[PDB]
Design a protein around this ligand. Sequence first.
Ligand SMILES: *S(=O)(=O)c1cccc(S(=O)(=O)Nc2cc(C3=CCCC3)ccc2C(=O)OC)c1
Ligand SMILES: *S(=O)(=O)c1cccc(S(=O)(=O)Nc2cc(C3=CCCC3)ccc2C(=O)OC)c1
Ligand SMILES: [Cl-]
Lengths: 231, 231
Amino acid sequence: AYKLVLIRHGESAWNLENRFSGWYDADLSPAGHEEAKRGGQALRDAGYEFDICFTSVQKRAIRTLWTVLDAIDQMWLPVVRTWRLNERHYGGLTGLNKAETAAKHGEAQVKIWRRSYDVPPPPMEPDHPFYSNISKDRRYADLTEDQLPSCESLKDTIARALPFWNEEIVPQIKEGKRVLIAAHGNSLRGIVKHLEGLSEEAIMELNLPTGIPIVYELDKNLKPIKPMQFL
Amino acid sequence: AYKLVLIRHGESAWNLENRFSGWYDADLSPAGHEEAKRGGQALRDAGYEFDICFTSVQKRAIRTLWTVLDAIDQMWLPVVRTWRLNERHYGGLTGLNKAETAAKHGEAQVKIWRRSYDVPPPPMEPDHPFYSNISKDRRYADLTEDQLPSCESLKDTIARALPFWNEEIVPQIKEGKRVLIAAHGNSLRGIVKHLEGLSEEAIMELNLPTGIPIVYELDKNLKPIKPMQFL
Ligand SMILES: *S(=O)(=O)c1cccc(S(=O)(=O)Nc2cc(C3=CCCC3)ccc2C(=O)OC)c1
Ligand SMILES: *S(=O)(=O)c1cccc(S(=O)(=O)Nc2cc(C3=CCCC3)ccc2C(=O)OC)c1
Ligand SMILES: [Cl-]
């Protein structure tokens, strides 16, 4: 029955500095752009077609989608952007590199934050160097005070992604529309967890490849009939 | 006063081949892409901010928009695509150059089609080389038999563009959303004609520059308080 394709964007400008990006609107790096080109070419070679695309409000996912649509000659497709598909919000860690994070927060907290499904990093406070840049960005002006995160656990990220999946994407799939979702590793983890009924342990061990189309075949109940395949 | 900005795309691949494009989905030329970059930088330098963008389903306009959004750091804006902002459908002239057009159709008809507001070019028939490429493109699959043009006069083009202006663009302007329209000379002519109440001869004498932001200041009735100005 249904065919669904996911793609995770590749490397960003702040990956080049080993800095936590989260909601900071870092562009794709040159390598990340190349990855998006390769994924688009793989979809082209296999003859994939879509009817609607979903992405975040972060340019590294948007640019990945743009690159894929260019490659498959489907630049005319409707595109829907939502903050709900944004990368996980890395709170006060935003902008820090690994050494600054270890020095400021210590080895024990970092290990907990890294391995935990439901413990968030510290909040991004108003004196944070990127607070004005992110929390006062006008693209989030329509979020409620409670919807705008100061930080997110993976559980938090999944919890604000799945309402968009249920309310906006699932109805498209059930109408037979061929959906492409270009987003971020942690927002895509929420969709995979829901589709496959994966455990918290399993989803935290799932590292979706970047720039590689992830293909699902779904039955009438949107249940996968086979494991995810990589193009 | 509301601020509305229009931009017309620049040179296409088929401009360099001196071929009538119409609904053929020709990409920008490199020079047309650079034009869009300069228009984007002019908007950047003037500090322009938008809230929603409209474009056609033709990549030469979509790419112009993409380039402007990149230049002004507003890739996160919602984008709506519609066939109703497409270039005029040049019918059977699609793909021909000036000499082939004159030979097949004669100087008298060419003069009429070029200076006329309401006489369409010949229809694109099912044996036309680009018939399947345009008329059976699935991006138009939702148009009714009656809506799918085989050709368009300027009057026809304006007649299917202004319903989109009223259906989707006017409601945004009324809510105070700052609109950017990236489209084609003849579909933008429909908006200019409507806004300033120009005659058929005036709109046909008006040549909108490519790559130059065109700025309207509109009163509460969406009526221009002064004529369009170039940035
Ligand atoms: S996230 O998926 O967008 C992201 C960004 C940057 C690095 C990583 S990592 O590969 O998982 N390494 C890592 C993650 C963390 C986390 C704290 C909050 C949640 C995740 C801490 C430390 C490290 C690291 O590698 O230590 C040196 C994931
Ligand atoms: S149109 O605005 O997209 C377009 C494309 C290419 C060339 C022109 S032109 O400069 O106006 N010359 C031209 C136009 C036409 C038309 C037939 C249908 C509507 C317009 C016919 C002939 C010529 C030409 O210059 O013949 C010498 C516009
Ligand atoms: Cl877009």
